Write a protein that binds this ligand. Structure first.
Ligand SMILES: O=P(O)(O)OC[C@H]1O[C@H](O)[C@H](O)[C@@H](O)[C@@H]1O
Ligand SMILES: O=P(O)(O)OC[C@H]1O[C@H](O)[C@H](O)[C@@H](O)[C@@H]1O
Lengths: 611, 610
């Protein structure tokens, strides 16, 4: 069989090269495009199932491959030189319908995409039935087939309150009931009516949770600090590393601290262990102060969860349990009860603004025609680079210091959703799926790793994200900030030729002919490196809501095109299972022989030196 | 240009006729053959000939052959075939300390057998790496593009053996500044340094960016258990006015010491932040009825190479802490730039930090290649970067104090080796530095490990941990480290379709159809690599050793690829273009001279900025 596959591989390669439209200098590009699905299916071979051909055999996919072989080595500037108003034709704006005339604007023009490639990318949406999938997901159909679940984070922010049905019942009444419950608690805390066991108003909130129950609340509290009540300090314990709880406990006055235990399952080992430790340390502190423990936990601990039974066991009153539902994915849970810490920080009205921004982006996504659909366009630009240029990564570069946790947040949203190797129809993928997300807030990144983005050997798609207006007016800081935002994307695209560099070196003087000759390529910029520029008028709660929903929907479109399930996360189960067994073996002086020699050796090293 | 196509097809034909790849793996041979062609196509705009000095190395060609033969094997294959693989594929550097600390590397969970390992070591010989190392350590001007020495190792040279630059021993210079740092840090820590109204310093605000920011902040976070909690440390870096504004709101300005950290003292973000901080500080004193006479001299110090600009800012000569051109910014934690660290953790702990790097330096320069920890890290990285073709490198510290280590290594690695041209003026024919990413464990497990386990990219991972915690509570550290060991095991061994099926069938509650569809979605390929790095405890000495180890890994990789790890020309174009655009950011101003995107974006900003 293997010999037959080889003879076939060679036949397919010969045919592909004979039929390719690639320029004579670019034959290697046709080979790379041909070879991509072969290399993916080799790497995924231990899945032990057939390769999915449903995407790669789409007429549009064949056409995109042909267009890549033709255009993939062209500059980006070429398209601008050919169309003087390319910017107007390769950008679009979503109105946020707010009193401050806010918006989300996408400029996707600094890309290797011409009108033909763009038409064919839109045709891929049609051929893969993406618009019908979107309608099914929005209507509550159980599109998370692996877990037989609906996918309805959009219900959480459904301000229209049109019914959305799960198991024959409208979910909106319960969504709105929990929002009202959240409102009442946040109001009591913000107004100083919620008192601790010794009568102190709450001045500290400590969220305990991990992953989806941590990244969102923290990112949003950071992002929306200008809209917050500064009298209430927000803390986020997440690592099981004892350092995390210990350092946060050191920062708070426990008599005025509200603990929020955030866990969809309420069984995650890190979160439940942190919660039990926090409760133990809290009660011990009270006892040391001669303060009665009777009724203290009920005043100082609340829970955000789907599991009432587990919350009860912990000792939290059901009245202080904030419910959400199985159709709320953890990495999509900011909008739900999980956002309670956020609502305490910025207030109910601002939380509703946050929901409303997401809702407006939802309405745009579901209703706008494909050609004018901002999240679909984001998704297609991403696929062009991810699947045809073969870029492994995606940089997220927000030029707003409050947004410094956005890259980490989008890391979970994107990579945990679409880091998949098997399709919903039980096959292995033949195309690349989710990319690796990385990034830091600008301008800091410019002084850390943009060197590589400009001059290295990898093509890195970059999303530059900014606000036209600052919340903190000081000197010329915001103008300087945004001069960098605009300049970096210009620089990535246009580069700097050897001829330009040579002239500059000669004009600077002080160097020999040979010295200049060595130096020229080292100071040359290829250019032709792509970016998207995303702008809002101002980073308000509404704008942040729109931005996050925008990426949720980008991820939806990409997953659906690739044929994978964006909404499960099976890949975390093996590690949890293996860690349970190892934990039992972490005892001083215990010898271990049942694993591979590395795992055995590492555990024994730990067991021999741990004290 | 059809002659190039003809030749390409001939070369590919010959490569396939001679390849020893298994029948099922022809695509792997094609991928290997095609890699330099794709690199040189992508770097074509550099307009110079391709470097073949690396690809022509006999060891490079042999590694290519071994990749085509062994590249699709599981990782477990080599464990099954050698019962003590762990012993042969691990090593430890002794940190010579009273607490018996160490740096231990386990590189066994890799696609590397004895034959590949030997050939990787031969590559070190063939690229003259050991000789390069000696030249660099000796102060030779190996940063050829800038005609500079590269001597961050002199900064922590506790032995005080002479090291010469322009025929002069730099060690007396290094030691004088350390003593200067000692004196200031002691005055601050002892409450002797008073502000303009007589208050002891309780807040330190470092203003700096990149190399003048990431190291100091990373180290102050990493070494918090060894710090003076009476002194709050703050790090302003972004020009975004939010950064300075929020920090100013957290401090009492009457007891704040500002530290302006900038090698050039001309970086736009840092000098603008420093001028604004100076302004707000003086407005604050005035609002409190406090005299401004001599106030800047009392509250501002500088870490720099530029004495004139420091003088111009108003800082006294006694409070300028010098370092030197041969200290790269991303290698500068060990110099005057580390002043905020020394204030926070004290002179003695800062000396421990230097000592740890020094011991790693001694190991690096003296240990044989086969037992050289940074060289092995570099070689493992090159195997994946250049032969498997992985674009990234994950850095996963299982220590909450190390939460800024990935961002710090992002600069160290990517700004060093994110290069496309060689020192001899050619374009590279091989991939250079990978993209660094990561978050402290266990948090990353609940964020993005899903993709590391089940996605379509191979991602080399460095797992870094401490055997002992500084914060004993309950069973937290045992739980933390059970995850540390389990994740690397999981990545390697995966979970077969038969295992998955058995589990699903025992659990029940699903139709046959549901189970059939679910099995592939819950299968793990395994064969995904990792390094496990351990220290006994994350002390200042251990941190020093860890950073020095990565500095030297970067040195070795850069030297093998023939690039300059120590310059950074790639940041210049953006700075020039931003100064130009800044001139055009005025309300209502129309802009026509750029590309239509840059024009439109700027006009959008100018139309709606008010
Ligand atoms: O210390 P400075 O001279 O202010 O430079 C700070 C940083 O700015 C530059 O842009 C470089 O990217 C970094 O290598 C450097 O560390
Ligand atoms: O909210 P929890 O049930 O505690 O789960 C928190 C997190 O842990 C899991 O391992 C997943 O990786 C995440 O999808 C999830 O958000």
């Amino acid at each position: 069989h293997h010999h037959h596959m080889k003879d076939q591989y060679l036949k397919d390669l010969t045919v592909h090269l004979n039929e390719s439209n690639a320029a004579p200098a670019n034959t290697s590009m046709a080979v790379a495009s041909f070879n991509m699905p072969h290399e993916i299916t080799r790497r995924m071979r231990p899945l032990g199932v057939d390769a999915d051909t449903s995407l790669t055999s789409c007429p549009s996919w064949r056409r995109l491959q042909e267009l890549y072989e033709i255009h993939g080595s062209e500059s980006i500037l070429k398209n601008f030189d050919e169309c003087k108003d390319r910017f107007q034709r390769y950008s679009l704006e979503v109105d946020l319908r707010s009193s401050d005339k806010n918006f989300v604007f996408l400029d996707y023009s600094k890309t290797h995409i011409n009108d033909e490639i763009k038409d064919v990318l839109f045709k891929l949406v049609e051929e893969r039935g993406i618009r019908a999938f979107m309608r099914a997901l929005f209507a509550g159909e159980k599109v998370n087939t692996a877990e037989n679940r609906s996918v309805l984070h959009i219900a959480l922010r459904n301000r229209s309150n049109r019914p959305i049905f799960v198991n024959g019942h409208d979910v909106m009444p319960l969504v709105n009931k929990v929002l009202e419950q959240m409102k009442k608690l946040s109001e009591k805390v913000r107004r100083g009516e919620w008192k601790g066991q010794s009568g102190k108003p709450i001045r500290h909130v400590v969220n305990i949770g991990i992953g989806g129950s941590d990244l969102g609340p923290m990112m949003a509290c950071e992002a929306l600090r200008p809209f917050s009540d500064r009298r209430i300090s927000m803390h986020f314990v997440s690592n099981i590393d004892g350092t995390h709880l210990s350092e946060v406990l050191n920062l708070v006055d426990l008599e005025s601290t509200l603990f929020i235990i955030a866990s969809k399952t309420f069984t995650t080992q890190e979160t439940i262990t942190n919660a039990l430790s926090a409760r133990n340390e809290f009660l011990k502190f009270l006892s040391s102060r001669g303060i009665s423990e009777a009724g203290a936990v009920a005043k100082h601990f609340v829970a955000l969860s789907t599991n009432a039974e587990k919350v009860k066991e912990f000792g939290i009153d059901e009245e202080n349990m904030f419910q959400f539902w199985d159709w709320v994915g953890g990495r999509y849970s900011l909008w739900s009860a999980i956002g309670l810490s956020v609502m305490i920080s910025i207030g109910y009205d601002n939380f509703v603004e946050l929901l409303t921004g997401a809702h407006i982006m939802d309405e745009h996504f579901i209703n706008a025609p494909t050609e004018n659909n901002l999240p679909i366009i984001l998704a297609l630009v991403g696929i062009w680079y991810n699947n045809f240029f073969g870029s492994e990564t995606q940089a997220i570069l927000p030029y707003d210091q409050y947004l410094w946790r956005l890259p980490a947040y989008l890391q979970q949203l994107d990579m945990e959703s679409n880091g998949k190797g098997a399709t919903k129809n039980g096959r292995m993928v033949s195309t690349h799926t989710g990319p690796i997300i990385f990034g830091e807030a600008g301008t800091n990144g410019q002084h850390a790793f943009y060197q590589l983005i400009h001059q290295g050997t990898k093509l890195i798609p970059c999303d530059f994200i900014g606000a036209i207006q600052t919340q903190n007016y000081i000197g010329e800081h915001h103008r300087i900030l945004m001069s960098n935002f605009f300049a970096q994307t210009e620089a990535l695209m246009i580069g700097k030729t050897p001829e330009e560099v040579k002239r500059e070196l000669e004009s600077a003087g002080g160097k020999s002919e040979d010295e200049i000759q060595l130096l020229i390529p080292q100071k040359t910029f290829t250019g032709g490196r792509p970016s998207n520029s995303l702008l809002v008028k101002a980073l308000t709660p509404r704008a942040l809501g729109a931005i996050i929903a925008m990426y949720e929907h980008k991820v939806l479109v990409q997953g659906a095109i690739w044929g994978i399930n964006s909404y499960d996360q099976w890949g975390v189960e093996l590690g949890k299972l293996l860690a349970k067994s190892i934990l039992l073996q972490l005892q001083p002086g215990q010898k271990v022989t049942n694993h591979d020699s590395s795992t055995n050796g590492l555990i024994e090293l730990f067991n021999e030196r741990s004290h």
